[PDB]
Ligand binder design. Structure first.
Ligand SMILES: [Cl-]
Ligand SMILES: [Cl-]
Ligand SMILES: [Cl-]
Ligand SMILES: [Cl-]
Lengths: 32, 32, 32
């Protein structure tokens, strides 16, 4: 379970960062 | 702590996916 | 590895919530 967990956190890290970047751009495009 | 961790990753998975979906729609609505 | 994992989930919790809040506002600003 520890390796399952670490693999999944590694994946979540990436998706969260991606979402941060997309939100940053959207904020710019809307002026927020 | 292992069960706490897994429960929390399970919850984070869901929220991240939800955020991905909402961002996808917003990108469409703004044209991004 | 357990402490590394918990520290990282704690950080991901925060970033996910932040992203939720930003998405909520954007949805309002676009009308989504
Ligand atoms: Cl990171
Ligand atoms: Cl997220
Ligand atoms: Cl998933
Ligand atoms: Cl939380």
């Amino acid at each position: 379970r520890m390796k399952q967990l670490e693999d999944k956190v590694e994946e979540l890290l990436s998706k969260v960062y991606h979402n941060e970047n997309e939100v940053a751009r959207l904020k710019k495009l809307v002026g927020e």
